[PDB]
């Protein structure tokens, strides 16, 4: 299903002023907006062509929300330092991700909203969009505050309404890129490393969205422990790249197969080195 997802990060810098806030928004794996409180001009800004036409009212509206959330995050960081009895001297990080998945009726299929402190799960909205899961006794304080503030009902209203409505608008305005899967273009390269071993590297290029599986098999047996698998990476043009490599006995290359799974492929792809 299609999704709209927002991501934000606040980072404190004690003794060097107030925390910095950076936020981005995505439809699927395509970014469309950014905000940085430390930017030369701190405003919501377009990062995809299909949002460039939105008027100054949209951009004013979004900018004000980002500035308000940055201010709230400053308070949250202060509260969290207290909960965990941490010194005023250390820098800390607060991350938030929330989003909506679009269902087959044009309404919410599922919503999610989660927060992390210093890179560890803190509190999450449950699938019912009514209750919260707290990671520890500090997040149970937040849980009690947000139950009393009826916070989940607010988040649910956004996820069920505004989130899905705008996700649908973006999907229509950017349909010729957002509603198009691009299959991976693959090839296998070969690099001898000794007088009896060689690297086989299986490539996937130019694919969208970013989710992909690349695996090597020997005689049909998965070799994941012995596979070097780089992180999926952006090409810079909206598509993604990945490779997986194994070191194999020279002369056994025919017994190794690379397997590729991607939504743009009608069936899983099986590859061999051919030269």
């Amino acid at each position: 299903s299609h999704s709209m997802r927002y991501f934000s990060t606040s980072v404190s810098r004690p003794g060097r002023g107030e925390p910095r806030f950076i936020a981005v928004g995505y439809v699927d794996d395509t970014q469309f907006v950014r905000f940085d409180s430390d930017a030369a001009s701190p405003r919501g800004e377009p990062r995809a062509p299909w949002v460039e036409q939105e008027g100054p009212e949209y951009w004013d509206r979004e900018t004000q929300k980002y500035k308000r959330q940055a201010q709230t995050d400053r308070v949250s960081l202060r509260n969290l330092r207290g909960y965990y009895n941490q010194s005023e001297a250390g820098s800390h990080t607060l991350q938030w991700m929330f989003g909506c998945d679009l269902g087959p009726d044009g309404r919410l299929l599922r919503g999610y909203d989660q927060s992390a402190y210093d890179g560890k799960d803190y509190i999450a909205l449950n699938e019912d969009l009514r209750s919260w899961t707290a990671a520890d006794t500090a997040a149970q304080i937040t849980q009690r505050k947000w139950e009393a503030a009826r916070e989940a009902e607010q988040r649910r209203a956004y996820l069920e309404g505004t989130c899905v409505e705008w996700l649908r608008r973006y999907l229509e305005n950017g349909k010729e890129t957002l509603q198009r899967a691009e299959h991976p273009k693959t090839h296998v390269t070969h690099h001898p490393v000794s007088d009896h071993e060689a690297t086989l590297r299986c490539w996937a290029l130019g694919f969208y969205p970013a989710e992909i599986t690349l695996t090597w098999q020997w005689d049909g047996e998965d070799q994941t422990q012995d596979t070097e698998l780089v992180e999926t990476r952006p090409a810079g043009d909206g598509t993604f790249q990945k490779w997986a490599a194994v070191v194999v006995p020279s002369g056994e290359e025919q017994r190794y197969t690379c397997h590729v799974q991607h939504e743009g492929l009608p069936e899983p792809l099986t590859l061999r080195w051919e030269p």
């Binding site: 959330q69 709230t72 308070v75 949250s76 509260n79 969290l80 607060l94 927060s115 803190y122 509190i123 997040a139 937040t142 505050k145 947000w146 503030a149 916070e151 607010q154």
Partner: peptide, 4 residues
Amino acid sequence: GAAL
């Protein structure tokens, strides 16, 4: 919204 609410602070943590």
